[PDB]
């Protein structure tokens, strides 16, 4: 096992920073602050971060560096009875690949669309517009903004699809963009972390160059301080309501991606004695710091929109793809040198996503390269075949009704699947492997054991932190619908199978090899709870 290693430590730090910092840092965190009491939201956000997020983030980083294997092999060597956890985590990463990159394609599509003297999404008098178009965002459902109609009627053409059944034609301009992202991903994850860890230099750092420019541009706009007000002004009344605590908890969990399989894979290439504790604290902070900085970039322009462009703050302080593809471009198209802002903004969105794609794909490539040597020998071939399956199936999301299909995956691919997977990860680590056996492994790496704080969080808070999410996530459940469309009950089932195809691997694999070893019930519940290294 002469495993290779990051050519430099910045390769690892930027790879981790890059995987963590993505569009969610821009189109969800600032919105949650504005919605849940401004500055006061940082109280439950920081608590959930210190008590649930960073612990789990730290845990997987240490496991990866210590056990020095991908997700499948790692959990197998940790507790065999739960080797299925590694399979669930790899399958979930596989599913989210089918839709995460098409959002990067949208960014390139808008990027190539900004090479013009006047941006197309500015006015309401184009072939794609309707008589109900209006210049900027409003609050009546049947009257979209110019930028909304451009995104909807020209880029997506979603208006020509009656639902998930009616997909329609394949927009080959989107398919070309999707290919350009898989080509970029290929010659990046091409020959391992040797080049991967270098491409991450541009993709992980470039967003801070643009955030810096847009931050100055935004704070120097009439009314930007008004935006900073809607962003932060405290209202600690929100702290009392439990909806903001589950909001903070959920955002913290999904923004760090602890136990998703990629932090494991990335850490497994570190040197055994790397101070992975200093790494977990450093990168986890840089992640939340980037969200905070981004909120100023967004709401500085949001206030400008509400003060000079005359719109209601509630009509533009949105979240999700609508914020970056409709609301913000609209404001960009209204300021001097708009072509410049549009070009670097859409380029930022692209590089924000690429990093996170790399991480999800590496989680798969590494996990398989460590469990089936046929793949490790032919790396360039495997990913070539993987991305091809991605692109080909991805053409179903370059269709006109692709959003309906893509929206389905978003709510089912990893939504509850990853939560129950990480719950077992925490249960396995602390209770079946052992926190003392785990703390002992960390002592051998960094020279000191984790404090009792980190041990208490891995053993009791992390499982409660994750149930607190899954419980309130099931309580707020409602059938799948986008705008007026109600998904048919067969689609609602298709998602549950996607959700179950990963989670079932846990009990399924626990049943298969629970019968594949010889001996008594207890004699086998112990041959399958003895770690691999405790065998030499």
């Amino acid at each position: 096992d002469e495993r290779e290693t990051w050519s430099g430590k910045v390769d690892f730090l930027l790879s981790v920073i890059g995987f963590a910092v993505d569009l969610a840092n821009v189109w969800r965190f600032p919105y949650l602050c504005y919605k849940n009491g401004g500055g006061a939201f940082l109280v439950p956000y920081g608590i959930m971060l210190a008590v649930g997020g960073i612990p789990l983030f730290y845990m997987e980083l240490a496991l990866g560096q210590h056990n020095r294997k991908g997700a499948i092999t790692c959990w197998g060597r940790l507790v065999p009875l739960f080797k299925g956890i590694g399979y669930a985590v790899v399958l979930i990463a596989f599913y989210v690949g089918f839709y995460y990159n098409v959002i990067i394609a949208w960014s390139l599509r808008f990027f190539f669309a900004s090479f013009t003297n006047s941006l197309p999404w500015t006015s309401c008098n184009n072939i794609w517009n309707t008589p109900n178009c209006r210049p900027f965002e409003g609050h009546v459902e049947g009257f979209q903004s110019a930028a909304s109609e451009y995104f909807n009627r020209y880029i997506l053409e979603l208006n020509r699809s009656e639902g998930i059944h009616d997909l329609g034609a394949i927009k080959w301009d989107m398919a070309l963009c999707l290919l350009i992202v898989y080509l970029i991903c290929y010659f990046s994850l091409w020959k391992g972390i040797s080049t991967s860890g270098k491409v991450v230099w541009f993709t992980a750092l470039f967003p801070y160059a643009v955030l810096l420019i847009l931050l100055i541009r935004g704070l120097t706009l009439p009314g930007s301080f008004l935006g900073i007000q809607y962003y932060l002004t405290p209202n600690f009344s929100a702290i009392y309501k439990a909806e903001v605590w589950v909001d903070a908890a959920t955002q913290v969990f999904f923004s760090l991606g602890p136990g998703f399989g990629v932090l494991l894979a990335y850490a497994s290439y570190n040197k055994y004695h790397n101070n992975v504790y200093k790494d977990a604290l450093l990168t986890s902070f840089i992640n939340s710091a980037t969200s905070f900085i981004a909120g100023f970039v967004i709401f500085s322009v949001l206030g400008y929109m509400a003060h000079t462009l005359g719109v209601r703050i509630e009509d533009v302080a949105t979240e999700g793809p609508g914020l970056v593809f409709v609301v913000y471009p609209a404001a960009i198209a209204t300021m001097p040198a708009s072509t410049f802002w549009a070009l670097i903004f859409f380029m930022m969105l692209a590089t924000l996503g690429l990093d996170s794609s790399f991480g999800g794909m590496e989680a798969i490539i590494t996990a398989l390269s460590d469990e089936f040597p046929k793949i490790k020998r032919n790396r360039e071939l495997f990913v070539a075949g993987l991305f091809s399956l991605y692109f080909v199936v991805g053409l179903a999301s370059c269709t006109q009704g692709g959003f309906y299909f893509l929206h389905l995956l978003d709510r089912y691919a990893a939504g509850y699947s990853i939560l129950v997977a990480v719950f077992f990860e925490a249960i396995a680590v602390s209770w079946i492997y052992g926190t003392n056996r785990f703390s002992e492994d960390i002592r051998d790496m960094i020279g000191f054991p984790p404090g009792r704080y980190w041990q208490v969080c891995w053993r009791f808070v992390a499982p409660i932190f994750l149930l607190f999410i899954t419980v309130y996530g099931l309580i707020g459940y409602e059938p799948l619908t986008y705008a007026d469309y109600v998904y048919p009950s067969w689609a609602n089932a298709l998602g549950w199978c996607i959700a179950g195809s990963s989670v079932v691997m846990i009990p399924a694999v626990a049943i298969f090899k629970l019968l594949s070893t010889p001996g008594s019930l207890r004699q086998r519940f112990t041959i399958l709870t003895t770690p691999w290294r405790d065998q030499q």
């Epitope: 056996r437 002992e440 000191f448 054991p449 290294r533």
Partner: antibody, heavy 119, light 109 residues
Framework: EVQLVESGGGLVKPGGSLKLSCAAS????????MSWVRQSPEKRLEWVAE????????YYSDTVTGRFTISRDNARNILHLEMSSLRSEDTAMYYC????????????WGQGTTLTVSS | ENVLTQSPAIMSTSPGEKVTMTCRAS???????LHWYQQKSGASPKLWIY???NLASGVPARFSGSGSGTSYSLTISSVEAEDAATYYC?????????FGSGTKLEMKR
């Protein structure tokens, strides 16, 4: 409050074998790595072996590897050192030292137990 | 093996004077891993300074530490008779763990 007591060990003929013991009291023995450090009659400190908190990580000095075996009993809070094929060079006072955190060092030492290897 | 050499081997001092002793390693040692032990004639060693500069519990303030890389030093501000002992440095950053050759501090009369 913390106490370490070495015991066993006296005169042994070359090639022979002997077993040292260290009694721990005043702390959660199972939470701390332990090491043996010996001091030759020429008063030179030399580290010999270390065993981790749960005994799953063990390091030996090159000059002792293959002949000494360090072991642990977290149930009874005892540290052992099994020595075989001894030589006169092994003559020394053997210390039992607590050292969980590499960045803090050996924060507690025993009174020592003397091994004389001679024909 | 990282051999640590201490100088001087013996050194006399009259109470009140300032004493400095050096610990030179044959390979770079992380400052956070260099430690110092005091051993009185007839007793067992006692942890004295850890991470180059931190005094152990019970160590009076007249003791200080400093250094980095391959050169470290223990320094007594105003030496007292209760300081007569042998001082061993030690590195905890690489196996095998290695102690310095020691500096014996004797009193001048």
């Amino acid at each position: 409050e913390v106490q370490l007591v070495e015991s066993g060990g006296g005169l042994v003929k070359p090639g022979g074998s002997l077993k040292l013991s260290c009694a721990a009291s005043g702390f959660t023995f199972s939470s701390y790595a332990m090491s043996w450090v010996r001091q030759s009659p020429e008063k030179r400190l030399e580290w010999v072996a270390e065993i981790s908190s749960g005994g799953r990580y063990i390091y030996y000095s090159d000059t002792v590897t293959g002949r000494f075996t360090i072991s642990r009993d977290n149930a009874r809070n005892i540290l052992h050192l099994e020595m075989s094929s001894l030589r006169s060079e092994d003559t020394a006072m053997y210390y039992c030292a607590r050292g969980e955190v590499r960045q803090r060092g050996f924060d507690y030492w025993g009174q020592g137990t003397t091994l004389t290897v001679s024909s | 093996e990282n051999v640590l050499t201490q100088s001087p081997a013996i050194m006399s001092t009259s109470p009140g004077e300032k004493v400095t002793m050096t610990c030179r390693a044959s390979s770079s040692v992380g400052s956070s891993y260099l430690h110092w032990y005091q051993q009185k004639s007839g007793a067992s060693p006692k942890l004295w300074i850890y991470s180059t500069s931190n005094l152990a519990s019970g160590v009076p303030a007249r003791f200080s530490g400093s250094g980095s890389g391959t050169s470290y030093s223990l320094t007594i501000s105003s030496v007292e008779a209760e300081d007569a002992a042998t001082y061993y440095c030690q590195q905890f950053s690489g196996y095998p763990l290695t102690f310095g050759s020691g500096t014996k501090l004797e009193m001048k009369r």
